[PDB]
Design an enzyme around this catalytic site. Structure first.
Site, PDB file in Angstrom:
ATOM      1  N   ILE A 260      -2.459  -8.131  -1.410  1.00 50.81           N
ATOM      2  CA  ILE A 260      -1.636  -7.186  -0.676  1.00 50.81           C
ATOM      3  C   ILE A 260      -2.360  -6.715   0.776  1.00 50.81           C
ATOM      4  O   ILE A 260      -3.489  -6.780   0.825  1.00 50.81           O
ATOM      5  CB  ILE A 260      -2.019  -5.675  -1.473  1.00 50.81           C
ATOM      6  N   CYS A 261      -1.565  -6.893   1.602  1.00 55.37           N
ATOM      7  CA  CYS A 261      -1.731  -6.624   3.116  1.00 55.37           C
ATOM      8  C   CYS A 261      -1.566  -5.054   3.366  1.00 55.37           C
ATOM      9  O   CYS A 261      -0.568  -4.426   3.347  1.00 55.37           O
ATOM     10  CB  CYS A 261      -1.000  -7.629   4.057  1.00 55.37           C
TER      11      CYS A 261
END
Ligand SMILES: [Co+2]
Length: 150
Positions: free
Chosen positions: A86-87
């Site tokens: 996840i960014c």
């Protein structure tokens, strides 16, 4: 070990006593530094109705560094890749010890409602979203149906 364990125990009491809505979380087994969590897809989004499983690894010096949080459920989104990475700024340089896993799960739910293709982790998914938002939403909805059933 010690300050970290006491903080994670406190967060686990808070999940039991006052969890974020539509979320659950707890240790895999007897290691409190290793959890599975779930979030339900946010309503009024392509992910609505899905149940998303997340893997949580707290570091030894939590809460001074962020937990590593990744999806175990397949999800179609420009800021989550095929490995479930996840960014999200708060999981990296914007981590603060005032954040909790509960707050992270709320932030990830918010991220699902705000797919931004301008600075993506998965550039191909972002290309679909930028070019044809309806097509992106349709695919995101299909992936929710296929891969995120409870
Ligand atoms: Co794990």
């Amino acid at each position: 070990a010690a300050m970290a364990m006491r903080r994670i125990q406190k967060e686990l009491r808070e999940i039991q006593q006052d969890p974020p809505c539509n979320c659950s979380a707890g240790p895999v087994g007897d290691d409190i530094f290793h959890w599975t969590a779930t979030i339900t897809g946010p309503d009024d989004s392509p992910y609505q109705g899905g149940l998303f499983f997340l893997d949580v690894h707290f570091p030894v010096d939590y809460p001074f560094k962020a937990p590593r949080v990744t999806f175990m459920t397949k999800v179609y989104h420009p800021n989550i890749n095929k490995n479930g990475v996840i960014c999200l700024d708060i999981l990296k340089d914007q981590w603060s010890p005032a954040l909790t896993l509960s707050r992270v799960l709320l932030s990830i739910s918010s991220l699902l409602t705000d797919p931004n293709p301008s600075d993506p982790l998965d550039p191909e998914v972002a290309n679909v979203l930028r070019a044809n938002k309806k097509q992106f939403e349709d695919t995101a909805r299909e992936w929710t149906r296929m891969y995120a059933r409870p």
